[PDB]
């Protein structure tokens, strides 16, 4: 027929936006699930990396299009809020964008699509929450089983009977039965080479990676300590500007050495006047953290020194110990010191790590550090990642209590209900919600295909079994078919499914609303 | 051939076209931003690393340069609207572009001289401005209705902004902030604090004028009967009338003995400050340990790094004087309040005032997840508070949703009934521009603007001059029942600015450039 | 040297080319001729966007290497300095004469015969122009003041100032009178300075008969005003280019101390010299201190304690404005300050203007002045700049009306009368010159026709009406409808141009036409 001439074509931008964004999602889609396919990337440095981790892939895909990049931010939001599902939030975004593209071709204005999808997302969340299996923080074993599940897909699963309760106790030490938001950044995972995977500890004050003092005269241990955090360097005067010292004999060398030593002595005496017992110096390569000459003075003062402490360790210390940074020896005073019952260096299988316990300070906050041990780098790196993910699982359970079955089950349950319920809606409401619900099946569809199963057969079985059955049914790659995934212990926190529904709506809403790209120069 | 040295030159046919094409190019930047359902624009700088998405028409016009020298004129005019009025930026820019867009056709197709168009627009503008006046209704009486009107205005002025998500709460927060004034319209009495953590729905209004910085290293947490003396002075190693004395020694001990001399001179200066009879001392500059201890020993509560905005806000609350010089105990105004208390808002330290001098001040406390969310929330409040504040002097309103625009275009079409020949089409063209706003509003909302606008016009034409667009249901509704109102003063500004903005470029038919540098 | 890379034009082709070059210039500025003329966008070397219809500014901003076009610019410069009115008309008319010259040359009339004919035609045009003149300053002084204001009001109507021009017309009238004595009737334009600030509206503008500084006082606690002090001899002002303190450098000091005895004295010297310098102000007997430089803290306290208000960092011209207005001197040093050097005024005070924080300092004589400043306000820079320049034009009009009382009616009426006279005389020549005399008259017609075209009027119906009315009814000046008034006949509309203005416009445009017509060779080299 004859219709809108469409001389000005804003749809050309939205089409470019959707095409670019969906391309990113389809690339990630094929890596979904324990049976997913690997991606290989050649980096700008020429290195070859292989991974099936969606977020790691997305960062290295080096997406250019200003709008397609937003799908990377979505995975970052998922990693920040939930810590899991980072691949699934982009995949659902891609499928929902495909729904939007079809709806646009059907004559639905992008404004209608964005708002209607938001309404569908609201109902999707309600459907998800009602169907979950509730948990309680009071049930320590239940928390261990939740962590143990996420640990069963790690490289060294034989120690999951240890890493699970470690993650559980680490959270419980700082989060009681009545908590909403737990920031697991207060649970510091500290690695050190040596020992074994089970050989871990939970420390209240801090675990540091560095030694204290090895030289003669050092106290090596202090009880009832006040602790300061140093960001300055303690070294003889060493300016950057032009300077010269002339020494023609040992007599002048003696004078010069006394000038250098007296400088450090005055610093060390002021530190003593502040009644500081332990110095924790932030790592820097500008000047010596604490010069040997200063260590001789500080040792005689019975002051412990820990050097080359990483920024991240310093930031944790400022919360666990109740102590404050000192920017310069000029301002080094008591008001900036914390407290601790015991500061000691532990040498276990050559560890030699300084730790603090018994802070008992009003400035302290519920923090905990975990000692990760292991012979090979792969052991301490795998353990840290394993505990981190386990902590993210528990954090999710606090924010929104409960787990749902995996294997695409909540996507079949939500889609199935929405497709039926949408039939009672009017106008664009029903037509759009049918496309929204259909988009959700990209997850159980992809899981079936990556598992080597017939795509239509599995989804057909999932539809039929959910109509007669319940959420517990889903795809099990271990059983290579549709079975009771709850009984197979394939469980994900509610927050992961809830967040994915939200992010998919927010991203598509954001993409559809962009009708132009302009430069600001 | 004249000119040279690679200058730009455009003659009647080219410069005239450029004037209109330029203005249209400006309109194309913001035509999508009109209404609560407007579309977003993605902006990216040459570095690629500043990519942002916004529907704020003012940001887009300021962020996106245009190379058309006539477009630069309209953009600069739109800037004035945004900075001086605080609202109407998109509406003026659209109406200006549409008034000039029709003017292009009037010259090329209707054989209308630019001078005829300008005079015709002036006549039509008077009709539109009169239409606003006759349709303008106040509730100056019955304070209950005035307060309600402010809430309805607030919800409208928050439209298209991040705050539109929770407008039910922020409409009352903004309204109460203005109602609290019972006095000056100056927004400098209202403070906004941006705190991370929580949701926007958790924002609070606190009439206690909350300060972002606390006082003292080791000083009491509450000041009773505070007497406020503000400073902008250097107190650090201040060598008073002993200038030119340097410290050169052969030992550290001697140097420390000499540093005492600086303490003695600072002690005199700090003592002279204490002679004012004060409890609280605020310095825009930093206060080193010596003057800090000297204040503490004399019982003076020390605040440092009180920046320009802080000092100016204190002047409007405590009533003190910045006093950059403290050589005499008199010739200074001192402020006062009943209580200064250290208070935690969202686990962040502040001070809370009570009993300040003739208090008209209040603070709106924002709770957001991201800096970008809070930055948009802060600006959105500023814009809404300006219109709500101005309403307290001009209490008349008109109906929105395209209603006022149809009423104005109705008057303009009526004016064209009694008009000379040449100017007739210009007057009708003015009306056609006016009705573009309800067209854009419907289009952005994803509705059929041709049906809604044509039917709306027939409603306003055949009496029923209460109707307007329902941009949520996609139909025509009574704006009084829905509560869709816009400030009379703002509508006068939008029509006035759009009319003059068009005239500026209507008077241009040549572009002359000097040698570039 | 380096004969190549040069341009040259000569001969019959140069005559066509040169006239076309002149036409190109006119084709731009002609569009701004008239009270309804269209504006230009003028783009500076830095990309600054300004809008104006001032032909003098436009031609000044037109940067060109066409030597014939440059001659037209030189014409507009002469008119801008001499009269200040016809800066567009003299170029448009000169082009019109050159356009007629083109046809005359093509028909076989030698350029010299054209130049001579145009000269004689100009003499006829002025001879008739005199017959239509009348006096404004004649008879009752009240009529002079009435017409003088009305002339300013009309001259303002071509710029944005037209909105509230009633106030700016008054400023022009008061400004020209305030610097002019009734007996001599000579106006020195340099006695009327223009000044303005961003803020407020143009309706807030006013004429200030004193000196205004855009500077604040040396110390916030220092008194902001000095009054005559209950009948004393006004206010005594100390105007200097040196601060009342021991001067200190901003670069190197190089002050060598050879002994401790000197060290202690040197520190004391500075403290004492601060006192001595302020004490010298009291010895002079000054009330206020105005210095090119600011003051140190010690000087501010000493000036404060002794009630000696002082203004800091006052610019060169601002110091001269005070010295001139107050009939004083600028004294480089302090030892010469006395009643014989200090300036006198009646009041010095700080004036606030609504929410504008400029807080200007105004020095008043409160009596007849030798100089005035026109204070312009407005909501933006371009508004102030244009309204301020609008006063410049109006000041030129009232300047010419004071100097030469003879005026003629404008709106193109004078050109039509002169065109008719030259046309009627042309038929009496019976010789070759008849072609140039008719051409000259046709060139004059281009002015009322331009006024028609720039107003949206038919120039053919308009000119036909203009000539018909001045032949059928009465030679009396008949104007055009360019102002949108109910009818023409400027006698009731008060659109009046000075005689000396219109006389120079016609003579100078004719001389310029001859300046270009006589050019038979142009050689252009490079630019170093």
Swiss-Prot record, chain A:
InterPro entries: Chap_CCT_delta (IPR012717), Chaperone_TCP-1 (IPR017998), Chaperonin_TCP-1_CS (IPR002194), Cpn60/GroEL/TCP-1 (IPR002423), GroEL-like_apical_dom_sf (IPR027409), GROEL-like_equatorial_sf (IPR027413), TCP-1-like_intermed_sf (IPR027410), TCP-1_chaperonin (IPR053374)
PROSITE patterns: TCP1_1, TCP1_2, TCP1_3
Disulphide linkage map: none
Subunit structure: Heterooligomeric complex of about 850 to 900 kDa that forms two stacked rings, 12 to 16 nm in diameter.
Lineage of source species: Eukaryota, Fungi, Dikarya, Ascomycota, Saccharomycotina
GO MF annotations, alphabetized: ATP binding; ATP hydrolysis activity; ATP-dependent protein folding chaperone; unfolded protein binding
Annotated protein name in UniProt: T-complex protein 1 subunit delta
Broad class of where this protein is predominantly found: cytoplasm
Primary role: Molecular chaperone; assists the folding of proteins upon ATP hydrolysis. Known to play a role, in vitro, in the folding of actin and tubulin. In yeast may play a role in mitotic spindle formation.
Top-level lineage group: Eukaryota
Keyword ATP-binding listed: yes
Curated annotation (Swiss-Prot), chain B:
Primary site of residence: cytoplasm
Cell location: Cytoplasm
Gene3D superfamilies from the UniProt entry: GroEL, GroEL-like equatorial domain, TCP-1-like chaperonin intermediate domain
Source organism superkingdom: Eukaryota
Keywords for this protein: Acetylation, ATP-binding, Chaperone, Cytoplasm, Nucleotide-binding
InterPro entries for the chain: Chap_CCT_beta, Chaperone_TCP-1, Chaperonin_TCP-1_CS, Cpn60/GroEL/TCP-1, GroEL-like_apical_dom_sf, GROEL-like_equatorial_sf, TCP-1-like_intermed_sf
A GO term from the CC aspect: chaperonin-containing T-complex
GO annotation, biological process: chaperone mediated protein folding independent of cofactor; protein folding
Disulfide bonds: none
Key word Cytoplasm present: yes
GO MF terms held by the record: ATP binding; ATP hydrolysis activity; ATP-dependent protein folding chaperone; unfolded protein binding
Family: Belongs to the TCP-1 chaperonin family.
Protein's job: Molecular chaperone; assists the folding of proteins upon ATP hydrolysis. Known to play a role, in vitro, in the folding of actin and tubulin. In yeast may play a role in mitotic spindle formation.
Quaternary structure annotation from Swiss-Prot or TrEMBL: Heterooligomeric complex of about 850 to 900 kDa that forms two stacked rings, 12 to 16 nm in diameter. Interacts with PLP2; this interaction leads to inhibition of CCT complex mediated actin folding.
Protein name: T-complex protein 1 subunit beta
Swiss-Prot record, chain C:
Subcellular location: Cytoplasm
GO biological process: chaperone mediated protein folding independent of cofactor; protein folding
Keyword line: ATP-binding, Chaperone, Cytoplasm, Nucleotide-binding
UniProt entry tagged with the keyword Cell inner membrane: no
GO cellular component: chaperonin-containing T-complex
GO molecular function per UniProt: ATP binding; ATP hydrolysis activity; ATP-dependent protein folding chaperone; unfolded protein binding
Main location as per UniProt: cytoplasm
Family: Belongs to the TCP-1 chaperonin family.
Function per UniProt: Molecular chaperone; assists the folding of proteins upon ATP hydrolysis. Known to play a role, in vitro, in the folding of actin and tubulin. In yeast may play a role in mitotic spindle formation.
Known partners and oligomeric status: Heterooligomeric complex of about 850 to 900 kDa that forms two stacked rings, 12 to 16 nm in diameter.
Name under which the protein is recorded: T-complex protein 1 subunit epsilon
The species this protein was found in: Saccharomyces cerevisiae (strain ATCC 204508 / S288c) (Baker's yeast)
């Amino acid at each position: 027929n004859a219709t809108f001439k469409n001389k000005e074509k804003p749809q050309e931008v939205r089409k470019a936006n959707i095409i670019a964004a969906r391309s990113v999602a389809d690339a990630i889609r094929t890596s979904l699930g324990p049976k997913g396919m690997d991606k290989m990337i050649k980096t700008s440095r020429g290195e070859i990396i292989i991974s099936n981790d969606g977020h790691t892939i997305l960062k290295q895909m080096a997406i250019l299009h200003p709008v397609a990049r937003m799908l990377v931010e979505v995975s970052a939001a998922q990693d920040s809020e939930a810590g899991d599902g980072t691949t699934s939030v982009v995949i659902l975004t891609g499928a929902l964008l495909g729904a939007a593209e079809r709806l646009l071709n059907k004559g639905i204005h992008p404004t209608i699509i964005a708002d209607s999808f938001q309404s569908a997302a609201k109902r999707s969340v309600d459907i998800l929450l009602e169907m979950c299996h509730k948990v309680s923080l009071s049930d320590r074993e239940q928390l261990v089983r939740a962590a143990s599940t996420s640990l069963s897909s790690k490289i060294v699963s034989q120690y999951s009977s240890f890493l699970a309760p470690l993650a559980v106790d680490s959270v419980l030490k700082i989060s009681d039965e009545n908590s909403k938001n737990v920031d697991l950044n207060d649970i510091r995972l500290v690695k050190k080479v040596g020992g074994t995977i089970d050989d871990t500890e939970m420390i209240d004050g801090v675990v540091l990676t560095q030694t204290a003092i090895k030289s003669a005269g050092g106290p090596t241990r202090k009880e009832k300590a006040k602790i300061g955090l140093i960001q300055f360097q303690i070294s003889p005067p060493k300016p950057d500007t032009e300077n010269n010292i002339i020494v023609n004999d040992y007599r002048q060398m003696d004078k010069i050495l006394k000038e250098e030593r007296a400088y450090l002595l005055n610093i060390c005496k002021k530190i003593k006047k502040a009644k500081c017992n332990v110095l924790l110096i932030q790592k820097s390569i500008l000047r010596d953290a604490v010069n040997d000459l200063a260590l001789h003075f500080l040792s005689k003062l019975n002051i412990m020194v820990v050097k080359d402490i990483e920024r991240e360790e310093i930031e944790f210390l400022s919360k666990g110990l109740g102590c404050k940074p000192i920017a310069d020896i000029e301002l080094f005073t008591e008001d900036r010191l914390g407290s601790a019952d015991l500061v000691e260096e532990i040498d276990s299988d050559g560890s030699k790590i300084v730790r603090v316990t018994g802070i008992r300070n009003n400035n302290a906050r519920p923090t905990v550090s975990v000692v990760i041990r292991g012979a090979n780098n792969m052991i301490i790196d795998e353990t840290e990642r394993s505990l981190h993910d386990a902590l993210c699982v528990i954090r999710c359970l606090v924010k929104e209590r409960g787990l749902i079955a995996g294997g695409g089950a909540p996507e079949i349950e939500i889609s199935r209900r929405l497709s039926k319920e949408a039939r009672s809606m009017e106008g664009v409401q029903a037509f759009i919600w049918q496309e929204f619900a259909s988009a959700l099946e990209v997850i159980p569809t992809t899981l079936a295909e990556n598992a080597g199963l017939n795509s239509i057969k599995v989804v057909t079985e999932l539809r039929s079994k959910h109509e007669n059955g319940e959420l517990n049914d889903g795809i099990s790659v271990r059983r290579s078919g549709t079975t009771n995934t709850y009984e197979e212990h394939i469980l994900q926190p509610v927050l992961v499914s809830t967040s994915a529904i939200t992010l998919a709506s927010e991203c598509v809403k954001s993409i559809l609303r962009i009708d132009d790209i302009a430069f600001s120069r | 051939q004249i000119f040279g040295d690679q200058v730009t030159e455009e003659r009647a046919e080219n410069a005239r076209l450029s004037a209109f094409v330029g203005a249209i190019a400006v309109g194309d930047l913001v035509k999508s931003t009109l209404g609560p359902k407007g579309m977003d624009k993605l902006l990216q700088s040459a570095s690629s690393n500043t990519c942002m998405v916004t529907n704020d028409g003012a940001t887009i016009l300021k962020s996106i340069p245009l190379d058309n020298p006539a477009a630069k004129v309209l953009v600069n005019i739109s800037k004035v609207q945004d900075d001086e009025v605080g609202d109407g930026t998109t509406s003026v820019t659209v109406l200006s572009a549409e008034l000039l867009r029709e003017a292009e056709k009037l010259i090329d197709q209707s054989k209308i001289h630019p001078q005829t168009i300008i005079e015709g627009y002036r006549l039509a503008s008077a009709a539109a401005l009169d239409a606003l006046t006759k349709a303008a209704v106040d509730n100056s009486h019955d304070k209950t209705m005035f307060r309600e009107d402010l809430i309805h205005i607030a919800k409208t002025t928050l439209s298209s902004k991040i705050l539109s998500q929770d407008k039910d709460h922020f409409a009352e927060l903004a309204t109460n902030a203005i109602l609290r004034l019972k006095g000056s319209t100056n927004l400098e009495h209202i403070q906004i604090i941006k705190i991370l953590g929580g949701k926007l729905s958790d924002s609070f209004l606190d009439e206690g004028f909350i300060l972002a910085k606390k006082f003292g290293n080791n000083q009491p947490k509450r000041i009773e009967n505070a007497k406020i003396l503000i400073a902008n002075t250097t107190l650090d190693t201040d060598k008073v009338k002993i200038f030119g004395t340097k410290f050169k020694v052969d030992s550290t001990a001697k140097l420390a003995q000499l540093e005492k001399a600086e303490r003695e001179k600072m002690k005199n200066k700090i003592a002279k400050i204490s002679k004012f009879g004060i409890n609280t001392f605020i310095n825009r500059q930093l206060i080193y340990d010596y003057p800090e201890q000297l204040f503490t020993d004399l019982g003076i509560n020390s605040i440092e790094h009180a920046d320009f905005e802080g000092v100016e806000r204190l002047a409007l609350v405590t009533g003190g004087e910045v006093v950059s010089t403290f050589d005499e105990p008199s010739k200074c105004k001192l402020g006062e309040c009943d209580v200064i208390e250290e208070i935690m808002l969202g686990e962040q330290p502040f001070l809370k005032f009570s009993g300040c001098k003739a208090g008209e001040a209040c603070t709106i406390v924002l709770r957001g997840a991201t800096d970008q969310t809070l930055d948009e929330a802060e600006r959105s409040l500023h814009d809404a508070l300006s219109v709500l504040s101005q309403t307290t002097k001009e209490t008349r309103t008109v109906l929105g949703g395209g209603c006022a625009e149809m009423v104005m275009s109705k008057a303009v079409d009526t004016e064209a009934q009694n008009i000379d020949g040449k100017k007739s089409l210009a007057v009708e063209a003015f009306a056609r521009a006016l009705r573009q706003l309800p067209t854009i509003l419907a289009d952005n909302a994803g509705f059929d603007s041709s049906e809604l606008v044509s039917k709306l016009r027939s409603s306003i034409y055949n009496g029923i001059s209460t109707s307007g667009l329902d941009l949520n249901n996609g139909t025509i509704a009574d704006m009084r029942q829905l509560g869709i109102v816009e400030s009379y003063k703002l509508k006068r500004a939008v029509v006035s600015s759009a009319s003059e903005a068009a005239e500026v470029l209507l008077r241009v038919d040549n572009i002359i450039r000097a040698r570039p540098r | 040297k380096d004969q190549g890379n040069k341009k040259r034009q000569h001969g019959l082709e140069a005559k066509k080319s040169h006239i076309l070059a002149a036409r190109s210039v006119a084709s731009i500025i002609k569009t701004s001729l008239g009270p309804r003329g269209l504006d230009k966008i003028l783009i500076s070397p830095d990309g600054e966007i300004t809008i104006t219809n001032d032909g003098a500014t436009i031609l000044s901003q037109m940067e060109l290497d066409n030597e014939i076009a440059k001659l037209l610019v030189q014409l507009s410069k002469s008119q801008d300095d001499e009269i200040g009115d016809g800066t567009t008309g003299v170029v448009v008319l000169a082009s019109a004469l050159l356009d007629q010259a083109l046809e005359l040359i093509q028909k076989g009339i030698h350029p010299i015969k054209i130049a001579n004919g145009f000269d004689e035609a100009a003499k006829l045009a002025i001879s008739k122009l005199e017959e239509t003149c009348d006096d404004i300053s004649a008879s009752n002084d009240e009529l002079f003041r009435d017409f003088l204001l009305r002339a300013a009001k009309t001259s303002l109507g071509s710029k944005i100032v037209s909105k509230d021009h009633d106030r700016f017309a008054e400023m022009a009238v008061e400004a020209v009178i305030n610097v002019m004595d009734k007996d001599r009737k000579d106006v020195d334009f340099d006695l009327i300075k223009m000044q303005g600030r961003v803020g407020g509206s143009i309706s807030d503008s006013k004429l200030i008969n004193g000196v205004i500084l855009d500077k604040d006082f040396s110390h916030p606690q220092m008194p902001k005003c000095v009054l005559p002090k209950e009948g004393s001899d006004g206010v005594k002002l100390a105007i200097l280019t040196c601060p009342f303190e021991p001067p200190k450098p901003k670069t190197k000091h190089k002050l060598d101390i050879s002994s401790v005895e000197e060290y202690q004295k040197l520190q004391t010297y500075e403290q004492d010299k601060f006192k001595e310098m302020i004490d010298d102000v009291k010895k002079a007997g000054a009330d206020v201190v105005i210095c090119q430089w600011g003051f140190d803290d010690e000087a501010n306290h000493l000036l404060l304690q002794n009630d000696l208000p002082a203004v800091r960092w006052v610019g060169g011209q601002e110091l001269e404005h005070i010295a001139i207005s107050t009939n004083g001197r600028i004294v480089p040093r302090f030892q010469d300050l006395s009643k014989d050097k200090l300036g006198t005024c009646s009041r010095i005070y700080e004036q606030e203007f609504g929410t504008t924080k400029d807080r200007m300092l105004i020095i008043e004589q409160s009596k007849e002045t030798k100089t005035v400043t026109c204070f312009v306000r407005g909501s933006n820079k371009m508004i102030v700049d244009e309204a301020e320049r609008a006063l410049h034009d109006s000041l030129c009009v009232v300047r010419n009306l004071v100097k030469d009382s003879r005026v003629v009616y404008g709106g193109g009426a004078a050109e039509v009368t002169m065109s008719l006279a030259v046309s009627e005389e042309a038929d009496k020549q019976r010789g070759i010159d008849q072609y140039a005399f008719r051409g000259f008259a046709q060139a004059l017609d281009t002015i009322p026709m331009t006024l028609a075209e720039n107003s949206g009027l038919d120039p053919i119906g308009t000119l036909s009406t203009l000539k018909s009315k001045q032949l059928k009814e009465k030679i009396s000046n008949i104007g055009v409808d360019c102002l949108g008034y109910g009818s023409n006949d400027m006698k009731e509309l008060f659109v009046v141009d000075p005689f000396i203005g219109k006389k120079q416009q016609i003579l100078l445009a004719t001389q310029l036409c001859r300046m270009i017509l006589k050019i038979d060779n142009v050689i252009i080299s490079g630019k170093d």
